[PDB]
Design a binder for this molecule. Sequence first.
Ligand SMILES: CO[C@H]1O[C@H](CO)[C@@H](O)[C@H](O)[C@@H]1O
Lengths: 198, 182, 197, 208, 158
Amino acid sequence: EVLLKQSGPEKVKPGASVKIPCKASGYTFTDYNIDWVKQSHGTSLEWIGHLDPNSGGTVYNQKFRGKATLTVDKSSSTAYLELRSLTSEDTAVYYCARSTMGVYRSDGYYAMDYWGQGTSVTVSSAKTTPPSVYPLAPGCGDTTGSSVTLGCLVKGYFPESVTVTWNSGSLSSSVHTFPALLQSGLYTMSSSVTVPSS
Amino acid sequence: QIVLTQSPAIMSASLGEEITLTCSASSSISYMHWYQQKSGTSPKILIYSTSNQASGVPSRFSGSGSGTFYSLTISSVEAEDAADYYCHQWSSYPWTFGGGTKLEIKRADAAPTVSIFPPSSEQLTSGGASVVCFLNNFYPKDINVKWKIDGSERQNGVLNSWTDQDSKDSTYSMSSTLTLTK
Amino acid sequence: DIQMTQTTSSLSASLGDRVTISCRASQGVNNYLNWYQQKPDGSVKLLIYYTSNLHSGAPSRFSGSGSGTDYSLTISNLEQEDIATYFCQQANMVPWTFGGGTKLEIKRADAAPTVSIFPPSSEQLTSGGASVVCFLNNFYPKDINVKWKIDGSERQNGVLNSWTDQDSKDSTYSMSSTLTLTKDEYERHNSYTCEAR
Amino acid sequence: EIQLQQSGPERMKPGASVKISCKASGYSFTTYYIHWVKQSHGRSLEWIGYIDPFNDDTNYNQKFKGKATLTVDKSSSTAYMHLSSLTSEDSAVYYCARSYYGSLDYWGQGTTLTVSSAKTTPPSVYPLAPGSAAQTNSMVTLGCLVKGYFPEPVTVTWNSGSLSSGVHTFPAVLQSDLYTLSSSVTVPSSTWPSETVTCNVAHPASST
Amino acid sequence: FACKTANGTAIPIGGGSANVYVNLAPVVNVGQNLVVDLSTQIFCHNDYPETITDYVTLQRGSAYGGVLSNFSGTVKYSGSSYPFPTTSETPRVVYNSRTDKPWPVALYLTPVSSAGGVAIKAGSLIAVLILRQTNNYNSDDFQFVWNIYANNDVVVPT
Ligand SMILES: CO[C@H]1O[C@H](CO)[C@@H](O)[C@H](O)[C@@H]1O
């Protein structure tokens, strides 16, 4: 079906530049426009610019005029967002979306109707550090009931992107994932699961 | 630049109740549009042109307003409606979004199902240790956790983390940890 | 509805002459009168709109004039490509109404018909019928009347006629007439004649 | 450039209904109206109505109300005319045209419609030769009579096209719901009967 | 003969003036049309259909503001299209009922070269249209003026 796919999370140095693709599929790429939206601090949404795939014309937000440029490639159904000089204020998740605006719509439906999953951008000079995984196990005083509780601990990783899977992805319920918290310049997170005694 | 204001930033509603979110604007605009963002998911259109449900949106969502004042109404709250709701205008350039309003579900209280874990051998090999305590599937969000070592309280090194409100059973969960040397 | 009448159905002209065609409306049209040209093969296209405006691609030989209830079309140098039919149409009020048409023809030296008469074939009689036919080839102008006489008596029924358009190579008109009877009715008479003036 | 393409000729039966199409190309389809015009036998133009491709608003001539119905399909830039409860008086040519500045600006090629209960019928051919005496001494006139066929058209030729000059072929005329045609050629009297001549008739509808 | 808009503002018998605020599309691409439909907005009726027939024509239509500076197009009126702004008066629409019927006018404006940014500002005047009414019965000829305003901004990608 109609689907927009962006790249994975990024880590960049201050003063660098980065380009984010967003590939379209499942619909006529030239029959709709493209929007870009930036979500900062996990709450604040704001609009970057609007792009016309047929001609490549753009409507920018004057807040982002010197920061971002929007480009298109019809030959691959791909749109790009490029950020010119990253600083600490440029850390956010950047979303591409499909917009019906551009022509006259008889029903009056002018909206961003399909979004791509965001690409998180982290700007830091610190170096990458692989995580350490320690398993969690119950103690001697189990008092085991019909079900038991296990978990995992991930400690000391950077930047912030970690996914935890249990039992090769066979379990999708009774699972808790905990958001990571900064600790002396490194992240740490844990997960937990409840399974019947076995 | 038109500023859209949502009040209050956090709002609560029990299952089956009717609740009305609000978004006010600095200057007059002709339409208001509403977006829904569930946790760990992109935003999604919910209402367009101030009164129209989008494609596939259940009929229990409605919108109304005019001029400088609009509102979004959820007639009967289901447990999957715990999300962040945003207001948006394109009637004036540049197009702006609201600050957001988080919706929380009220249910019956529940006791936390506690667990504890001693440091495993893997971290013991490196010389450091961390003791982890879980608290799963409890309501409501606010809870305080304390540690005791050899009959004495420890007041440092404790870090705590809360998950988001569940979209199935409307509960919270918390993980508390303590990191120590050998 | 607005009745639209053109003065003449046919216009004789010669190549290079100046031809003018007039239209008339039963009620004033605030301009909004158009002129179309239909080639003999049946294709139609617009020549002039809004009483004076040349459509793109139309030759410059055409011009328009008029106001109120009276309008005219003019061709400066009549050419061979310009031999066709012309219609005036009003667009001031719905329903839109058209004129009756005016077909152009080339002027010529008069020619008398080359008349011929044919008795029925044997095969028609074998199939139980009879048709006597009369040809009138290469006459001018196009007006002509044909009368069938049987044994000195007149007749007015059982006759089909067929006229061709003006011939391009020599500008002459032709016509045929067919009188169809049954075999028994045909055989009870002796004199069949075709006289035409 | 701007072009309007219609469906081909139609052959229907009384009491039936027919639908014809007009495919527009070369311009913004919803910006301009589309009209329909009917030319009878005897060639007088009558105006049917117009349709707005933007929202399918229609206006009809009071003469054709109930009979005609216009619709448009803006997805593929095509308009449709529907004429139902056909009678013999509905045989004509029907035109689709674009409108600009009060004038029918561009026209389709025209769709011919025939309403007749008659069925395919091969023609009879009868030769025509002079009677006891020739009408003229210098030239002789020979005729060919093609009778009682259906439907149109029919081609005729003399000596397989050898007599390319001096030949006349009158248009066909209906009688008893069947068509009748005749053709004539003229040759010098020194040629006939010395040199053979034959009238060749072909009817595609019956493969004759 | 009287006319009124969708929000209920009327022009009495004899002519007058009124304001119309129109919702437009937020973006129009290069090579696309900005449709301003006024048939859903302006309604007119005839007071004495039993004895009088009314003829209604668009006598003038003018461009202002952003539409003047960034757009070109055509007007669509009762069977045909004409330039906008109009260089002459149109043919007649007949009103013969006591119930409201729309005024069938629409503007199809397309961006010119060197258009960009905010093409039309919110609340700005974009057109004035003059409705001229004449009747069969007597010498009355009245003018109904319509002022068209943009109800939002419009932008054009560059
Ligand atoms: C009675 O006179 C009024 O009402 C008719 C209604 O058609 C108008 O034509 C006329 O101009 C006046 O407005």
